[PDB]
């Protein structure tokens, strides 16, 4: 798998991730993204792919 | 400021009496002066351009600007958008300072000088020239050389003809064979 | 070129607000005589005009073409628009950076009561 499928786990106390695709040979770093989380229904920073 | 004011009185009245224009804004004035250095052999040595930029920011007063490679060619084995050369644009007070410190103290330290050429104009009134050595500017300590890196100068003016630009620069020294 | 360059900077909003169809507050800047216009949504009919080429703002004032003039320009626009019943508008930056005299003009319009 060249471009590989990963997820975006919320840093809150909520068991929710989004899901997207990353590459290996372009990004050695993990992905930080602010995103909505429908438990507290606000926007939380996301990290921890897979 | 000096050769600026020298223009502002003598060259203005001189050219107006020469070409008897309808108005004074129709006279040639120098619009900008650009300076280029093609660093191309720095395809491998990335800091060759960094020290050449320090050299040009010692020649000029102001910090330079790198140039992006426009379109990639295999004739020079370059990639499109490559760190490829460095330029300095000059307008206004620093432009007149650079022209002052050029024509007074740099042209006669050109290696084995004879007067500059005649057909070096564009055809629509601009000028350009290229150097060989680079301690012709005083800001370079002789014990700091690392290549024979030259550079070229472009005086861009509003001369509506190259002969008008010739008569503009004949008010200066501007050696003229 | 300069004039057509500014118009192709402005044509963005000058046809988007057309397609919205709302009342437009249009400006023209020159370091002498800032101009201010309030135009109906179609674009062919103006409503409220105030400019420093008019004597009533020219003679009461320090210098034609500074932000301290433009403040009173938009203030006069706001009074002449409220007396005709126009307060809810939209703004035409006319290809100008919202930084200088247009910023002072619109801010003093908002302090005067023109509320877009």
């Amino acid at each position: 798998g060249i471009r590989e499928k990963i997820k975006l786990v919320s840093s809150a106390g909520t068991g929710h991730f989004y899901t997207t695709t990353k590459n290996k040979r372009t990004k050695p770093e993990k992905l930080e993204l602010k995103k909505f989380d429908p438990v507290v229904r606000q926007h939380v920073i996301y990290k921890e792919a897979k | 400021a000096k050769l600026h004011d020298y223009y502002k009185d003598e060259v203005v009245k001189k050219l107006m009496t020469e070409f008897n224009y309808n108005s004074v804004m129709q006279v040639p004035r120098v619009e900008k002066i650009t300076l280029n250095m093609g660093v191309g052999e720095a395809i491998a040595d990335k800091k060759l351009l960094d020290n050449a930029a320090a050299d040009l920011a010692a020649i000029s007063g102001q910090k330079p600007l790198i140039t992006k490679a426009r379109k990639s060619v295999a004739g020079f084995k370059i990639r499109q958008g490559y760190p490829i050369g460095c330029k300095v644009t000059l307008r206004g007070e620093r432009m007149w300072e650079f022209f002052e410190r050029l024509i007074t103290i740099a042209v006669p330290r050109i290696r084995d000088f004879r007067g500059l050429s005649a057909k070096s104009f564009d055809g629509r009134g601009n000028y350009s020239m290229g150097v060989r050595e680079q301690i012709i500017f005083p800001e370079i300590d002789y014990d700091k050389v690392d290549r024979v890196r030259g550079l070229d100068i472009t005086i861009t003016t509003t001369a509506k003809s190259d002969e008008e630009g010739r008569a503009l620069l004949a008010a200066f020294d501007f050696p003229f064979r | 070129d300069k004039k057509s360059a500014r118009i192709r900077r402005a044509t963005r909003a000058r046809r988007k607000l057309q397609e919205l169809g709302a009342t437009r507050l249009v400006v023209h800047r020159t370091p002498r005589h800032i101009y201010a216009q309030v135009i109906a949504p179609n674009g062919s009919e103006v409503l409220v005009a105030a400019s420093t080429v008019e004597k009533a703002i020219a003679e009461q004032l320090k210098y034609t073409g500074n932000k301290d003039a433009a403040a009173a320009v938009g203030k006069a626009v706001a009074e002449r628009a409220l007396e005709k019943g126009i307060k809810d508008v939209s703004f035409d930056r006319s290809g100008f950076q919202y930084h200088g005299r247009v910023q002072a003009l619109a801010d003093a319009a908002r302090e005067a009561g023109l509320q877009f």
Binding site: - | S60, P108, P138 | -
Partner: protein
Amino acid sequence: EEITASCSCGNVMKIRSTVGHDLNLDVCSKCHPFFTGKQ
């Protein structure tokens, strides 16, 4: 910064230059062998 150049022609000339040091010269625009060189 403005400095002062001075050549051997007696041409004391103050100029702005980013040398950061006063300057000694020989040839100026005044008294250079350009016309004698062409001759």
